[PDB]
Amino acid sequence: SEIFLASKRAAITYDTDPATGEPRAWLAPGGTGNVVAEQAGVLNISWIASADSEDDRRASALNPDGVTMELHSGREILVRLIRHDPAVFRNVQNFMTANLMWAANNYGWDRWTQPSFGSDAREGWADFGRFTRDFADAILKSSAQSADPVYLVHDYQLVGVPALLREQRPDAPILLFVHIPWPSADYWRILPKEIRTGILHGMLPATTIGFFADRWCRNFLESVADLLPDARIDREAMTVEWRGHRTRLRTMPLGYSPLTNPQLPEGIEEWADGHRLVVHSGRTDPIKNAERAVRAFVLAARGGGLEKTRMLVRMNPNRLYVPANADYVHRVETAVAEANAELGSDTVRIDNDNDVNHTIACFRRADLLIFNSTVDGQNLSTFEAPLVNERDADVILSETCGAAEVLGEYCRSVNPFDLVEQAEAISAALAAGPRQRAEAAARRRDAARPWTLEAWVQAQLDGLAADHAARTAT
Amino acid sequence: SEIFLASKRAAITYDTDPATGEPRAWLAPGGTGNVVAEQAGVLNISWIASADSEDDRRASALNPDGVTMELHSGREILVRLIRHDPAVFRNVQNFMTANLMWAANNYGWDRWTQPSFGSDAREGWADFGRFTRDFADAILKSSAQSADPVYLVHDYQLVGVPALLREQRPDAPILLFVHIPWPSADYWRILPKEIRTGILHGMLPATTIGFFADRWCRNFLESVADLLPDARIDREAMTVEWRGHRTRLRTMPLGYSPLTNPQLPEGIEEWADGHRLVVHSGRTDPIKNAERAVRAFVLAARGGGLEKTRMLVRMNPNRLYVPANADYVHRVETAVAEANAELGSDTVRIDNDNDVNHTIACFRRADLLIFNSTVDGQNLSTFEAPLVNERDADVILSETCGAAEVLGEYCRSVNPFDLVEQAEAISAALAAGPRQRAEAAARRRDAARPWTLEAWVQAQLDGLAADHAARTAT
Ligand SMILES: Nc1nc2c(ncn2[C@@H]2O[C@H](COP(=O)(O)OP(=O)(O)O)[C@@H](O)[C@H]2O)c(=O)[nH]1
Ligand SMILES: Nc1nc2c(ncn2[C@@H]2O[C@H](COP(=O)(O)OP(=O)(O)O)[C@@H](O)[C@H]2O)c(=O)[nH]1
């Protein structure tokens, strides 16, 4: 049971021993790779990923075949890093952002005015083709010696990988995990033909394609029927038959890593002290929907009873170079700016720093939590925030978040495009009693706790194992 | 077989006899109502619709119970017009435009920034509730005397109608026709809850819900499964079982009315003379996608071989008051303006007049025709233009147009968001030979000709009849 895990980034920390002065390379826990190395069947694991630092590039060239790295139980994993054509790599990264692929899987486009694919998409795809050849090659190269390689393929960047893997090792078990949603067939279809088909041609040769949510899987299967005449779907069995490949689609939900007291960001406590605090947290991504959250807070305050309540928009900076992240951050400032002009000043604050620790302090402080994403593959903060909060905070969750399948019954679920509803739910949550809240919180945690990172990985290993036996038999 | 047809508008022409001076009211042919009165089973027909003129209002109040009107074979139909609360009526009309309902069925929204439903949607819905009560009431009132009323309900405005009809006449056959697309379940779901459910609650009590395209039906059924736990779908049988109603979904495609030589618009012939002419035609709606057509013409001309080719954007003014129609018209001018600055001047012209006759002349003149809508319930011009053209013009059709199910094999079909493809198809069509074109044209017409308006109506009558027998039996 020799395992080869491929990820877009493998999280490595590069630093100097604070005594030695010697440069250190280590892996950060949880981990995925770290965690896989921890399970029952696993004999060995190798992790393969792209280089994005020059720390990466520099440490890569010193060990082309990979560097063996050690964590728990004196275990080890072999970490191989790929140095791509820098021009090629940089282009594919823009291919995966809101400029192209991120809008497609995450419902960015309006159809009426976006998108308008030109030459750039052709060139981006070609490059994605090239970038995929690297990974497949690097992974294969790494597995030449192994007898029975089990391949785990992660991140959306690696979609075209399994085909090129099944090309060379046809009996091998291949799982592709996609952490992001899958668009409806009409939406998936917006993509240029060579792109809407090519992604599906790359994905299907896998033993399993794992998603976070049932809705993602179904959407995927609908696309296949829509776009591949040769493919047969079973909506019940979650299978696809195409070109002699049998593919199973599983939903393997994720919640949190428990292997993860922090201070609030500057002045936030004094700012918050004496007020109930509404918190919204996310990356600087358009999907996270903080603008509507801010407006909805405003429609609520107008309702009354939102005296002495404050709202914190916790944001995490990410990929600000993409216009959509930029616009979205700007679009939120305007909202916040207006909410303060209408309802009082310093009623709302934004924090845009990149501390993980600062967010967890925010989760703990919060009296109401909002995770009303327009869409979310899963959203793991929505599991995380309830589990660390001792204020018995209610959660407003979007129904378009994958976590909703797991946590929607036990949270306040709203259509993420309705301000009237979202507002109503804000005041509803803050009208609600301590004891009503105290019991709904305990139950919310009971539903959230089981989905640890570890279990998610066992699902993958157990799930691929079973599906492998099936493909092998069929 | 007493028939009662309900439409949003019943097309009446109000004028003075050019001898008498007496004010005249007549119905324009084809007609629908006119055409129904023409079929085998029909004993009598009554047509019920909203008043939008003051011509309407004025002629309505003179005959509250309806005015009997005469066309063919000295036949007659009884035409009843509804005067609604003008404030109520005006609000629902804004409810059906790109501001709300049109964006929902026609993929207007971007999700990231639109839509943001507030109080206006609540108030619009309430009003739609009121507006539907009128129609149901007016229709019912009209049918009090009849033994076995067959009800035909048309236009998207009348969706909530059949429920209120099935409320009062539970054994009656009810067909609802929707001329517009149906959005994917994730897209349909953007609507506020009371709206995404309420429309489905209104529609289902029908014997049949007829769509123009299979894709519409499927999308509808997916919404039901997504939004009504009580409902059971059969994707194969195109049925829904909900609350004791059995509903069948049929696809009943429409092409054209043959019961419909005109001059070109001003200067167009002299402008066109000596050049091949590219034509795009539609209403001033965002879905019609003339901007991308213009750009795609531009990517083509850059290709070469587009010397001495001109492009005419035929537009029909409609509902310019809605921002989207406005923006779209502006967005096109910019495109056209730029295409002329780059490739030569007066290479591209726009016509925005409201003559039907001017468009048919344009269809006849055209050497290449473009109907690359972003989405279209059907699009009947795409059937119409090939059938009147004697230049053997190729058609570029969008694959998101319903007519594609009928005409996609015999046209050049493109993803409507890909300029590179659309461009390629432009030059491909104009590279193509006279004889290649001459034969593909004859075949295109063979596929288009059968779908007359009349047949579409027989489909409805025959289709409801059969479905009625079934619901009656089940
Ligand atoms: N780097 C960083 N991570 C954070 C921050 N705040 C929270 N996190 C963690 O980053 C992850 C974000 O969760 P999730 O919603 O699933 O991420 P998403 O893919 O961007 O939607 C969670 O584990 C958070 O606890 C921050 O400010 N910076
Ligand atoms: N009133 C009007 N009708 C037109 C014009 N040009 C074409 N038409 C007719 O209007 C109908 C428009 O066809 P269709 O694409 O199915 O309409 P859509 O619902 O707006 O997409 C066709 O019968 C055309 O022949 C025009 O300039 N004004």
UniProtKB/Swiss-Prot annotation, chains A, B:
EC number(s) on file: 2.5.1.135
Catalysis performed (reactions): validamine 7-phosphate + GDP-valienol = validoxylamine A 7'-phosphate + GDP + H(+)
GO BP term, pick one: antibiotic biosynthetic process
Keywords: Antibiotic biosynthesis, Transferase
Residues binding validamine 7-phosphate: 179, 376-379
UniProt keyword Transferase present: yes
Domain of life: Bacteria
Matches recorded under Gene3D superfamilies: Glycogen Phosphorylase B
Signal sequence, renumbered to the chain: none
Binding site for GDP-valienol: 155, 283, 288, 314, 318-319, 354-355, 359, 380-381, 384
A molecular function (GO) term: alpha,alpha-trehalose-phosphate synthase (UDP-forming) activity
Functional summary from the UniProt entry: Involved in the biosynthesis of the antifungal agent validamycin A. Catalyzes the condensation between GDP-valienol and validamine 7-phosphate via a nonglycosidic C-N bond formation to yield validoxylamine A 7'-phosphate.
Quaternary structure and interacting proteins, as annotated: Homodimer.
Family membership noted in the UniProt record: Belongs to the glycosyltransferase 20 family.
PANTHER family cross-referenced by the UniProt entry: BCDNA.GH08860, TREHALOSE-6-PHOSPHATE SYNTHASE
Name recorded for this polypeptide: Validamine 7-phosphate valienyltransferase
